Amino acid sequence: SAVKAARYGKDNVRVYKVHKDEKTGVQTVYEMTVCVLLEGEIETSYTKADNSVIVATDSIKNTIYITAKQNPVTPPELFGSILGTHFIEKYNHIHAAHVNIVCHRWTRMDIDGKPHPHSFIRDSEEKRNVQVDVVEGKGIDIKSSLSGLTVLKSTNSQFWGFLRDEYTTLKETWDRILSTDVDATWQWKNFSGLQEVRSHVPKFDATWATAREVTLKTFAEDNSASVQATMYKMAEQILARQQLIETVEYSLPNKHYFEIDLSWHKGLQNTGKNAEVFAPQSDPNGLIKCTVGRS
Amino acid sequence: SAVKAARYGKDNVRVYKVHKDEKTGVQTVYEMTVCVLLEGEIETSYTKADNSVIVATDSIKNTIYITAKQNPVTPPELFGSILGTHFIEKYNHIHAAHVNIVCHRWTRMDIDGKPHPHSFIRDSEEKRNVQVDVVEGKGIDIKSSLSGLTVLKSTNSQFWGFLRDEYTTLKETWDRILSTDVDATWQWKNFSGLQEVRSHVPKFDATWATAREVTLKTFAEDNSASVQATMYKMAEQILARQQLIETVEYSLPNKHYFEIDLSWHKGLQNTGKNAEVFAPQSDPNGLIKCTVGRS
Amino acid sequence: SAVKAARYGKDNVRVYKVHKDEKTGVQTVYEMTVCVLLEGEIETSYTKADNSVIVATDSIKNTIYITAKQNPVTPPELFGSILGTHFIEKYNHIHAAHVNIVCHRWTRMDIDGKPHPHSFIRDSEEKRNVQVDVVEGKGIDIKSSLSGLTVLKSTNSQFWGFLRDEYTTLKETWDRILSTDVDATWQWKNFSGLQEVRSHVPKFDATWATAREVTLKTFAEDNSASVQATMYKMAEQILARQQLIETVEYSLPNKHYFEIDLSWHKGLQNTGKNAEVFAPQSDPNGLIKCTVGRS
Amino acid sequence: SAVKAARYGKDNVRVYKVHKDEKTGVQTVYEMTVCVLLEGEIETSYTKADNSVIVATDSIKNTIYITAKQNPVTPPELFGSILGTHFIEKYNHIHAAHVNIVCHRWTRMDIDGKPHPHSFIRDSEEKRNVQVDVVEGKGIDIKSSLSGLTVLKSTNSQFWGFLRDEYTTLKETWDRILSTDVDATWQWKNFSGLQEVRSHVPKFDATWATAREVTLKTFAEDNSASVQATMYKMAEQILARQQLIETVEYSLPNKHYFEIDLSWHKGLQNTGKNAEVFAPQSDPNGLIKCTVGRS
Numbered sequence A, B, C, D: 001s002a003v004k005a006a007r008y009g010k011d012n013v014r015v016y017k018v019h020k021d022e023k024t025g026v027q028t029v030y031e032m033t034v035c036v037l038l039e040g041e042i043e044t045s046y047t048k049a050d051n052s053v054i055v056a057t058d059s060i061k062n063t064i065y066i067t068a069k070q071n072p073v074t075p076p077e078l079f080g081s082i083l084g085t086h087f088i089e090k091y092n093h094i095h096a097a098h099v100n101i102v103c104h105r106w107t108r109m110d111i112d113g114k115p116h117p118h119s120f121i122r123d124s125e126e127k128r129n130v131q132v133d134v135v136e137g138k139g140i141d142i143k144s145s146l147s148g149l150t151v152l153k154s155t156n157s158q159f160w161g162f163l164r165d166e167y168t169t170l171k172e173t174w175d176r177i178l179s180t181d182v183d184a185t186w187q188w189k190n191f192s193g194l195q196e197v198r199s200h201v202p203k204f205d206a207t208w209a210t211a212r213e214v215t216l217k218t219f220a221e222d223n224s225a226s227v228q229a230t231m232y233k234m235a236e237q238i239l240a241r242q243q244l245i246e247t248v249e250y251s252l253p254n255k256h257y258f259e260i261d262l263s264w265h266k267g268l269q270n271t272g273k274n275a276e277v278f279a280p281q282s283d284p285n286g287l288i289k290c291t292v293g294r295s
């Protein structure tokens, strides 16, 4: 037998950093969870109990904290690129660093209509994420995402004209609830290395803001024919607004809200145009996925 | 042996209601999880397999949907009181209804600076809750709460002058991070029945808003001597602002953010005044509780 | 305003202890999560920012590890009593210690039919718990429990003869699935102090074993008229088997498994006697509670 | 813009099936969660709002229940193969069916040392899983796994001789705790279709039992040089025992148990040979991955 693939490192590394403006007294906080997994000439750690080739996961943890101390942690695409570049440059026998970052929301509080200098609220479980693959000889592959963006619209969703056969019970509808948890990923053009990433730094926050704005406006404004048709329009618009993105991927649950027939009770009318009270379904759920790229 | 206490019913009943203004086309959505547990002359269902005294949990579920269809679901204090009153009035042998409601946030989207008529975002897992105990002959006991309000301040928290003995390692600090998940409960004056609850309906949204605004402002502005001292200021302000509340309870985790000594690495200075990078601690956590009443 | 009630301390303290028999080389492991909340003359920490009365939660954490080092961690009733007694005895102004322990399962592996000296498996998220309230002048109040015991029987459950009115849709059944997550608590006679707890130490493991064995056997053998009737039989048997218990409490969800009518598809028969395929329901769930004492 | 990739279907489909032996009265239960995602000529559902190409996710849900009614649900490799084959055969324009199954443990209860005919316990959150990719023209690709197998050994784990540089603080150890959640996957030789899967049916349960037995014995018996070296020996042994497997993948967290230095307290000795009480770490964790194949 032989090692066909191996990666190892530290997962679930919680990191906080504060920036303090001494003149203005304004503080800014960043919180993330970091995973770094390394590849390279490490097969003998598995086959021959040779630990000499292991950079200890505990050392990888220390390096994440040291990197946060000595570099900007924003945007996460940059921090991930710096972190991954460190491991392949520092260690000759390490050839790849896979960096996953989840960013947690700390939104500045407004108190009496004025932004507070050092108080923050977690205003959603929505995350901004990166996957940064730094591969020696092959540059830096970045996937940026937002996830856990939970939305609902109470009308202007439809689902009719789907295939009907002996497996089909679902009634066509011209007015239903649509609710999802938005998982949207944009894949960047391959970067040659850390210098190229640094040259595009302003595009990271700008493309995240674009992806979020397009997601929310399209969801709110689309008279939706299907999750499929709505998510495609989001992906189209994002591609049109950032030439350095090669693909946009959506993964969207259809979080079903079922009508409740109450006509068995005193002829209560709670379906179609009279539908007021619904049963949100925890499971099952539709799961709809698309990767959109350029002609 | 004998039944000293019994209650039974349906838990985790997910409910959605929509209001449609056909005039303005503005829709408003409400989503909640409901628990109803009944007490009364039900001992014989346990002792003698006498099901005649059981209002089926399935029927309690149906009753929750029917009540939502025929009544306002807001404020939850009112909806809980109506639901509880229904069971003790409908069924001679049912003497108490315990109604627990978790209200889920559906905040109207702003699209291009304008509130959207029928699109909503879950802005955080913060909940508004009620516990409504409807007890035949003894009226209606309401506890209102907000929970899962997650906040952090980067400075203006201190902890010094605490007891020091052979069990103490904690360093006194004059400048630390304070972060918590706010659980705040206000206990209402006993209400004689549904009529008295109805007569105070506007005070429920008002007092929730007050509790939340006092919580956020006190957290942001208090140069905190301790979790204990800060939470007491929140409770005393809420009591002073609503005479119909008897007590305010706070349950606050101290979600620790530890300094990381990096001086072992190239003399890096990341402690005291130089503290930038911290390790958020998942566990353990301080847990600090107070019930405040009128002196 | 004034403090009506206060308690504070450390929650989510994860503890592991190993016992090593150097003679046999057999090792035994114990893993628990501990919460300690103190009450006493602490009002001034809330009202006057007087930290002198605070035993730091960090110090309570240290005390938990020190107590584990210097005492048996089993049975948890004993460990809880020692820990609670420590705080009210060590500190003149501390008058109550509330100790909550969750015991995690580490079951010794059998390898090739022989128990392994130092390898363990988590055989299920079932927990053994204690709540130990040590109150100066009022002794030691212990509640013992098992929780997260998940069971299902495929037949020999019934539910018929329940109240039927205009809110009822549920069909009577003479043959259904019954599945639950067993939460069972036994309340001990008040103990005068740690000496009285020590004097009953063997009864703690014995009564836990009895409660679990009665639960499993009654569930498997009762041709169940209802959750109510079955849970009462468990409680009365446990009371009859341990005179030092005053009450037995059960809290049991009814985790519904719905029949699926497939007759719309090729006349497929999957209801009543033909029921093979079911839809397990995540929510809602029946919730059935009983406290049983001596008549 | 254009669709580069698309799949859609129903996720989180909870399924129960009972087998009843009428002669012996013995019942056997199977519980799973099923996900089916379809690919094919569906791009126009995204680009042109053409629902005519959609087999409704609700219809996919119905088909999962119907398939369970008309076929064996065990082994899951067979059920997944039948389910996936159905969708590509039934619908001309559907070219791939991706079937993910999680199997939940329902272990027969022993009552008074005799297996009960119809009572079951969830004896762990351990899962047995399959991923079945049925691709028209390209056959059936099966990955089988066990996951959530939580184990600990209190000694006979070591970690020394790893790389030491200016990032390294971790002390070499010749005796530590090792605990993990085992995620082990075996990848089958490509199958030409459902007939070939049916011809290997007995190998599925046998290879799962082998993978589990090898995992537990190797973990218990290996005097471990590293997670890397131990997981490699597991993968080797499994490959040696089933020629129809091409690869074995392990993904193993290192769930750290930290020594607690108590020497600051009355010279208490709780490190190295005196280490009895440990702090289990929730995060971070080592994450170690290997895919092992044949020379």
Ligand SMILES: O=c1[nH]c(=O)c2nn[nH]c2[nH]1
Binding pocket: A159, A170, A225, A226, A227, A228, A254, A286, A288, D008, D054, D055, D056, D057, D058, D059
């Ligand atoms: O938007 C939808 N897409 C689907 O594919 C689907 N299937 N059922 N309902 C659905 N809704």
Ligand SMILES: O=c1[nH]c(=O)c2nn[nH]c2[nH]1
Binding pocket: B008, B054, B055, B056, B057, B058, B059, C159, C170, C225, C226, C227, C228, C254, C286, C288
């Ligand atoms: O055992 C049961 N008890 C109940 O009270 C009930 N109500 N619906 N179904 C039920 N099953």
Ligand SMILES: O=c1[nH]c(=O)c2nn[nH]c2[nH]1
Binding pocket: B159, B170, B225, B226, B227, B228, B254, B286, B288, C008, C054, C055, C056, C057, C058, C059
């Ligand atoms: O605010 C705090 N209160 C406490 O009681 C405490 N104990 N340790 N740290 C603490 N911080």
Ligand SMILES: O=c1[nH]c(=O)c2nn[nH]c2[nH]1
Binding pocket: A008, A054, A055, A056, A057, A058, A059, D159, D170, D225, D226, D227, D228, D254, D286, D288
């Ligand atoms: O088994 C281990 N493997 C590793 O790679 C490692 N790193 N720190 N500790 C470790 N333990």
Ligand SMILES: [Ar]
Binding pocket: A015, A016, A017, A030, A031, A032, A068, A073
């Ligand atoms: Ar950070």
Ligand SMILES: [Ar]
Binding pocket: A180, A219, A226, A227, A230, A231, A252
């Ligand atoms: Ar959508």
Ligand SMILES: [Ar]
Binding pocket: B015, B016, B017, B030, B031, B032, B068, B073
């Ligand atoms: Ar609602």
Ligand SMILES: [Ar]
Binding pocket: B180, B219, B227, B230, B231, B252
């Ligand atoms: Ar606070």
Ligand SMILES: [Ar]
Binding pocket: C015, C016, C017, C030, C031, C032, C068, C073
């Ligand atoms: Ar322990």
Ligand SMILES: [Ar]
Binding pocket: C180, C219, C227, C230, C231, C252
């Ligand atoms: Ar039961």
Ligand SMILES: [Ar]
Binding pocket: D015, D016, D017, D030, D031, D032, D068, D073
């Ligand atoms: Ar099943």
Ligand SMILES: [Ar]
Binding pocket: D180, D219, D226, D227, D230, D231, D252
């Ligand atoms: Ar291992």
Ligand code: NA
Binding pocket: A087, A088, A089, A090, A091, A092, A093, A094, A095, A136
């Ligand atoms: Na390198």
Ligand code: NA
Binding pocket: B087, B088, B089, B090, B091, B092, B093, B094, B095, B136
């Ligand atoms: Na009544």
Ligand code: NA
Binding pocket: C087, C088, C089, C090, C091, C092, C093, C094, C095, C136
């Ligand atoms: Na005392």
Ligand code: NA
Binding pocket: D087, D088, D089, D090, D091, D092, D093, D094, D095, D136
């Ligand atoms: Na096909």
